[PDB]
Design an enzyme around this catalytic site. Structure first.
Site, PDB file in Angstrom:
ATOM      1  N   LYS A   1      44.500  37.092  53.041  1.00 20.75           N
ATOM      2  CA  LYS A   1      43.372  37.423  52.178  1.00 20.75           C
ATOM      3  C   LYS A   1      42.073  37.502  52.997  1.00 20.75           C
ATOM      4  O   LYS A   1      41.763  36.569  53.771  1.00 20.75           O
ATOM      5  CB  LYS A   1      43.213  36.328  51.064  1.00 20.75           C
TER       6      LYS A   1
ATOM      7  N   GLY B   1      49.258  42.973  45.193  1.00 21.17           N
ATOM      8  CA  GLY B   1      48.509  42.572  43.965  1.00 21.17           C
ATOM      9  C   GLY B   1      48.061  43.609  42.935  1.00 21.17           C
ATOM     10  O   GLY B   1      47.752  44.753  43.290  1.00 21.17           O
TER      11      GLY B   1
ATOM     12  N   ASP C   1      39.909  27.795  34.526  1.00 18.08           N
ATOM     13  CA  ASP C   1      40.105  29.261  34.689  1.00 18.08           C
ATOM     14  C   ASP C   1      41.492  29.668  35.109  1.00 18.08           C
ATOM     15  O   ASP C   1      41.707  30.650  35.883  1.00 18.08           O
ATOM     16  CB  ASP C   1      39.065  29.873  35.637  1.00 18.08           C
TER      17      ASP C   1
ATOM     18  N   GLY D   1      41.718  46.092  46.843  1.00 16.02           N
ATOM     19  CA  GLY D   1      42.585  44.987  47.267  1.00 16.02           C
ATOM     20  C   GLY D   1      42.070  44.306  48.512  1.00 16.02           C
ATOM     21  O   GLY D   1      41.860  44.956  49.537  1.00 16.02           O
TER      22      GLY D   1
HETATM   23  N1  LIG Z   1      50.413  33.905  48.674  1.00 14.95           N
HETATM   24  C1  LIG Z   1      50.645  35.017  47.998  1.00 14.95           C
HETATM   25  N2  LIG Z   1      51.881  35.468  47.817  1.00 14.95           N
HETATM   26  C2  LIG Z   1      52.118  36.630  47.126  1.00 14.95           C
HETATM   27  N3  LIG Z   1      51.176  37.385  46.509  1.00 14.95           N
HETATM   28  C3  LIG Z   1      49.901  36.954  46.645  1.00 14.95           C
HETATM   29  C4  LIG Z   1      49.551  35.797  47.394  1.00 14.95           C
HETATM   30  N4  LIG Z   1      48.214  35.633  47.320  1.00 14.95           N
HETATM   31  C5  LIG Z   1      47.759  36.657  46.618  1.00 14.95           C
HETATM   32  N5  LIG Z   1      48.754  37.435  46.214  1.00 14.95           N
HETATM   33  C6  LIG Z   1      48.743  38.636  45.417  1.00 14.95           C
HETATM   34  O1  LIG Z   1      47.493  39.287  45.504  1.00 14.95           O
HETATM   35  C7  LIG Z   1      46.790  39.299  44.224  1.00 14.95           C
HETATM   36  C8  LIG Z   1      45.339  39.028  44.519  1.00 14.95           C
HETATM   37  O2  LIG Z   1      45.190  37.671  44.986  1.00 14.95           O
HETATM   38  P1  LIG Z   1      43.931  36.774  44.706  1.00 14.95           P
HETATM   39  O3  LIG Z   1      43.998  35.514  45.620  1.00 14.95           O
HETATM   40  O4  LIG Z   1      44.025  36.460  43.248  1.00 14.95           O
HETATM   41  O5  LIG Z   1      42.659  37.680  45.050  1.00 14.95           O
HETATM   42  P2  LIG Z   1      41.475  38.246  44.132  1.00 14.95           P
HETATM   43  O6  LIG Z   1      42.045  38.438  42.747  1.00 14.95           O
HETATM   44  O7  LIG Z   1      41.042  39.505  44.854  1.00 14.95           O
HETATM   45  N6  LIG Z   1      40.260  37.117  44.250  1.00 14.95           N
HETATM   46  P3  LIG Z   1      40.071  35.813  43.155  1.00 14.95           P
HETATM   47  O8  LIG Z   1      38.832  36.257  42.412  1.00 14.95           O
HETATM   48  O9  LIG Z   1      39.861  34.768  44.180  1.00 14.95           O
HETATM   49  O10 LIG Z   1      41.374  35.678  42.348  1.00 14.95           O
HETATM   50  C9  LIG Z   1      47.521  38.236  43.351  1.00 14.95           C
HETATM   51  O11 LIG Z   1      47.307  38.527  41.954  1.00 14.95           O
HETATM   52  C10 LIG Z   1      48.920  38.377  43.894  1.00 14.95           C
HETATM   53  O12 LIG Z   1      49.597  39.524  43.273  1.00 14.95           O
HETATM   54 MG   LIG Z   2      39.343  32.671  44.068  1.00 10.47          MG
END
Ligand SMILES: Nc1ncnc2c1ncn2[C@@H]1O[C@H](COP(=O)(O)OP(=O)(O)NP(=O)(O)O)[C@@H](O)[C@H]1O
Ligand SMILES: [Mg+2]
Ligand SMILES: [Mg+2]
Length: 345
Positions: A43, A25, A139, A26
Site C-alpha cells: 500500500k 481492490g 468504522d 488504487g
Molecule cells: N493485505 C491485503 N490482502 C489482500 N487485499 C488487500 C490487502 N490490503 C488491501 N487489500 C485490498 O485492497 C483494497 C484497498 O485497501 P485499503 O487498505 O482499504 O485502502 P484504501 O481503501 O485505499 N484506504 P483506507 O481509506 O485506508 O481504507 C481492499 O479493499 C482489499 O481489496
Molecule cells: Mg485506513
C-alpha cells in the site's frame, strides 16, 4: 535498490525484492516478494505528513500495527521509503501478507451458515482484542476486511481517532456506523456491535441494510425497518437532531422474521433452526439504543457464534494498551517523526 512501475493510475517505487506488481481492490497492489518467497500486498501512502489530520492518522496506524498482535488483525511484514534522506522523503510503503479477497467479494459469493458464523466469530475475536487495547473502532466495514482462501479473516484498519467527532447534518462509506455515531451522541465499546450486525445482516441478504446518500437518508432507512426509538433515547439528542428525530413518521418496526425471512437464508429444519438462531442474534445487535444492545463478550457466547468458541482465541488480550497520545506539530515536524518511525522499522 528500488525501481518504478505504473499500476493503473498510480506509480509505485519499491524495493527490487518486490516483483510482478498488479492492481487490487488504487493505492494497493499485489506483488511477489523474492526474498521471503510469498505474495504480498503493498500500500502506498503518498506524503502522509501533508496536513495535521493525514499525519495523525498515518502515524497512529503505523504505531497500532506494531502494538497489536492477533490472528484476526493484519500485521505489517515491512515498511520502507525509497527516498534516500529526510529532505527528499515523500512516500511510505506498507507491506502485508496477500489475502485472497476482501469481505465484499466473499459476501457476493452467497455464504452458508458455517461460513457466516465462522467469519463473524473471527470479526468479534478481532474487535475484542482491539477493545482490550483501548481501541474502539467505530468504522468497521467490509471493504476494509480481508479473507484467506481457508476462511481466516483479518481486519485491515483501526478506525477513528478518539477525538474524531461526527455530526448528523454534516466521500466515505457510512452505512455501517452506529446511530450514536451518525446522530453525534456519546458512545461506548458496543458501538462496534452495531457494525457487526449490519455486516451480518448483509451476509444474509447480500445487500446493504441501511444505505443512504447522507446521515438523514440513513436514519430514515433505520427507523423504517427497526421502528421509532424510545422517548428516552430521543431526549439524549442535541436540539437540532432531536427535533428532526421527533417529527419523523412513527414506524413500528418489522419483526425480524419479516426483516430476514426464511426464504432469504441458505436453504429449505436444520436450516430453519440456524435461521432462527441468526435472527435472535440480529435482534440483539441491531438495536438502536446502545443501552439495550448486547456487548462483544455476550455476542461471542451467543448460540449462533459459540460453535467456534475457543478460550485461547477469545481470551487473547493485547500486550499493551494504546495511549491516545497521537500532539500539535508542524508539517515539517510531522515529516521527521514519520520518517524516523519508518527508518526504525
Ligand atoms: N493485505 C491485503 N490482502 C489482500 N487485499 C488487500 C490487502 N490490503 C488491501 N487489500 C485490498 O485492497 C483494497 C484497498 O485497501 P485499503 O487498505 O482499504 O485502502 P484504501 O481503501 O485505499 N484506504 P483506507 O481509506 O485506508 O481504507 C481492499 O479493499 C482489499 O481489496
Ligand atoms: Mg485506513
Ligand atoms: Mg479501504
Amino acid at each position: 535498490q528500488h525501481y518504478t512501475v505504473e499500476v493503473g493510475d498510480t506509480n509505485f517505487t519499491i524495493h527490487s525484492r518486490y516483483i510482478n506488481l498488479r492492481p487490487i481492490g488504487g493505492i494497493v497492489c499485489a506483488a511477489y516478494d523474492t526474498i521471503t518467497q510469498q505474495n504480498v500486498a503493498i500500500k502506498k501512502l503518498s506524503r502522509p505528513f501533508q496536513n495535521v489530520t493525514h499525519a495523525k492518522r498515518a502515524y497512529r496506524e503505523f504505531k497500532l500495527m506494531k502494538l497489536v498482535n492477533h490472528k484476526n488483525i493484519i500485521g505489517l511484514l515491512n515498511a520502507f521509503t525509497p527516498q534516500r534522506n529526510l529532505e527528499e522523503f515523500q512516500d511510505v510503503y506498507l507491506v502485508m501478507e496477500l489475502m485472497d479477497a476482501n469481505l465484499c467479494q466473499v459476501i457476493q459469493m452467497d455464504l452458508d451458515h458455517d461460513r457466516m458464523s465462522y467469519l463473524l466469530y473471527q470479526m468479534l475475536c478481532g474487535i475484542k482484542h482491539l477493545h482490550s487495547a483501548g481501541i474502539i473502532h467505530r468504522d468497521l466495514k467490509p471493504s476494509n476486511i480481508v479473507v484467506k482462501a481457508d476462511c481466516t479473516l483479518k481486519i485491515l484498519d483501526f478506525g477513528l481517532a478518539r477525538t474524531a467527532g461526527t455530526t448528523f447534518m454534516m466521500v466515505v462509506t457510512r452505512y455501517y456506523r452506529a446511530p450514536e455515531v451518525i446522530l453525534g451522541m456519546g458512545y461506548t465499546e458496543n458501538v462496534d456491535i452495531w457494525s457487526v450486525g449490519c455486516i451480518m445482516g448483509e451476509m444474509i441478504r447480500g445487500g446493504v441494510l441501511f444505505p443512504g446518500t447522507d446521515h438523514i437518508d440513513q436514519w430514515n432507512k433505520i427507523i423504517e425497518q427497526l421502528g421509532t426509538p424510545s422517548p428516552s433515547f430521543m431526549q439524549r439528542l442535541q436540539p437540532t437532531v432531536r427535533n428532526y428525530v421527533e417529527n419523523r413518521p412513527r414506524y413500528t418496526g418489522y419483526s425480524f422474521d419479516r426483516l430476514f425471512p426464511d426464504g432469504l437464508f441458505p436453504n429449505d429444519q436444520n436450516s430453519r433452526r440456524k435461521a432462527s438462531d441468526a435472527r435472535n442474534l440480529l435482534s440483539k445487535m441491531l438495536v438502536i439504543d446502545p443501552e439495550q444492545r448486547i456487548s462483544v463478550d455476550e455476542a461471542l457466547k451467543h448460540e449462533y457464534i459459540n460453535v467456534w468458541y475457543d478460550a485461547e482465541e477469545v481470551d487473547a488480550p493485547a500486550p499493551e494498551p494504546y495511549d491516545h497520545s497521537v500532539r500539535e506539530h508542524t508539517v515539517e515536524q510531522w515529516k521527521e517523526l514519520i520518517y524516523e518511525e519508518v527508518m526504525d522499522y
